[PDB]
Amino acid sequence: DFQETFKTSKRAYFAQIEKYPKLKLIDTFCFFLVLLGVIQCTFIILIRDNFPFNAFLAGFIICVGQFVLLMSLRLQLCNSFPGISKNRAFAEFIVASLILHFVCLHFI
Amino acid sequence: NSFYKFLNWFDDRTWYPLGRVTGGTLYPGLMTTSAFIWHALRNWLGLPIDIRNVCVLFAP
Amino acid sequence: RLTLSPSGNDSETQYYTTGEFILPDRHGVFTFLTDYRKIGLSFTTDKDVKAIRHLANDEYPRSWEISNSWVYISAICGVIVAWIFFVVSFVTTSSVG
Amino acid sequence: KFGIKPEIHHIFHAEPKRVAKPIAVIFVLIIFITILSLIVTWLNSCAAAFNNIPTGV
Ligand SMILES: CCCCCCCCCCCCCC(=O)O[C@H](COC(=O)CCCCCCCCCC)COP(=O)(O)OCC[N+](C)(C)C
């Protein structure tokens, strides 16, 4: 069961990546936005200390929220929403990705 | 006076032997839109009115 | 509570100072009195009431000076410059070439 | 009721503990490795293939 769904999903995903040269750029950005959050929590687990807690929480929020806006751009960029073009999803990505950096520079 | 002297304001006329610290005990937003309407009527539209009349006629 | 000590004196008076002391960890209103009630001598008092503020929101050690949050500043600058190199390298490429 | 009274003082609180600086230099070094790994990996594959350059007016 899971072998068939596994190899089916690997092949049907890798063909989709090799078709469009926009998708591997998104996913290459995404994976290293996961590794930033992982080692940034590893600093907390390594030495037991919790003192500048807001400065901990700001970078972690940058990693998670910045991951999510990429996944929304990917979902909206493969299949188009009814009424929204592909020139407007990108501008909304710029504006809403540009508010979040300011409110995570005030917070540290 | 300024907006910088309001966000961190220690008043010693309430709970007297141990005064309260306001900036971490109240909700700003009802005051600062009112000071904004006062600052817009006084400097731009041309007509100066008192702060008490902006505070009374703020709900209707 | 702490005992005053002799200081430089003029022709008719005699001055006493307390050097320097560091104010308390608690904020509020404080009063500063030094009375001299002694039997045989006269009675003298003097006092006043002053207010001791908490810290402001600007007077704090910043995020440079702690050396415990260099890691997170380095985990903000990378996402900023990686983001701008993302956006410039997105409108200068092709589709299914 | 009218003699001398003993002098006292105050007892502060201990400051929060800072961590020693020869660890934070190591971790900002690791971040400076990972970001350059990201830029090298973009320029390695077909992703950053600068080919629709908008020259003209
Ligand atoms: C898509 C993004 C959209 C962002 C929308 C931003 C809209 C905010 C516009 C605010 C304009 C303020 C203009 C202004 O300066 O008026 C002031 C100050 O007036 C005030 O007290 C109210 C302003 C407080 C600003 C609150 C922080 C910013 C919140 C929005 C980012 C009058 O207050 P006063 O009490 O008279 O004095 C203030 C201090 N001075 C230095 C000026 C002396």
With beta carbons less than 8 A apart as the criterion, state whether B36 and B16 touch. Answer: no
Residues 6+ apart with CB under 8 A from A26: A70, A73, A74
Distance (Å, whole) CA A24 – CA D45: 9
Domain count, chain C: 1
Give the residue from A24, A5, A1, A3 showing the smallest Cα distance to A14: A24
Q: Which amino acid is at A63?
A: C
Resolution in A: 3.5
With beta carbons less than 8 A apart as the criterion, state whether A107 and A58 touch. Answer: yes
- CB contact under 8 Å between C39 and D2, yes or no, is yes
Question: What size, in residues, is chain C?
Answer: 97
D partners (3+ CB pairs within 8 A) are A, C
Give the residue from C71, C79, C78, D29 showing the smallest Cα distance to A42: C71
Ligand 1 site residues (CB inside 6 A) read B 2-3, 32, 35-36, 39
CA torsion sign, A88 to A93 to A96 to A98?
negative
How many Å is the maximal CA-CA distance in chain B?
Answer: 45
Instruction: Compute the C-alpha angle C52/D6/C16, nearest 5°.
Output: 65
Ligand 1 closest atom vs CA B2: 39
How many of the other CB atoms lie within 10 Å of CB of A56? Answer: 21
Give the residue from B19, A103, C79, A8 showing the smallest Cα distance to D34: C79
- CB contact under 8 Å between C96 and A19, yes or no, is yes
Residues 6+ apart with CB under 8 A from C15: C6, C7, C8, C9
Among candidates A20, A63, A94 on the partner chain, residue whose Cβ is nearest the Cβ of C95: A20
- Any idea of the CA torsion for B51, B52, B54, B60, to the nearest 10 degrees? 170
Domain count, chain A: 1
C-alpha A68: how far from chain center: 5
Instruction: State the structure-solving technique.
Output: cryo-EM
Calculate how far, in angstroms, residue C46's C-alpha sits from the geometric centre of ligand 1. 46
Calculate how far, in angstroms, residue B33's C-alpha sits from the geometric centre of ligand 1. 9
Distance (Å, whole) CA C93 – CA C85: 13
Among candidates D18, D34, D47 on the partner chain, residue whose Cβ is nearest the Cβ of A25: D47
- CB contact under 8 Å between A24 and D27, yes or no, is no
CA distances from A23 to A89, B51, C69, D37 (A): 15, 58, 34, 19
Q: For residue A91, give its domain range.
A: 1-108
Calculate how far, in angstroms, residue C66's C-alpha sits from the geometric centre of ligand 1. 31
C-alpha D9: how far from chain center: 39
How many of the other CB atoms lie within 10 Å of CB of A11? Answer: 10
Whether C8 has its CB under 8 Å from any CB of chain B: the answer is no
Whether C70 has its CB under 8 Å from any CB of chain A: the answer is no
Rg (C-alpha) for chain C, rounded Å, is 31
Chains D and B touch (3+ CB pairs under 8 A): no
CB contacts < 8 A (A, D): 33
Q: For residue C83, give its domain range.
A: 1-97
Calculate how far, in angstroms, residue A105's C-alpha sits from the geometric centre of ligand 1. 19
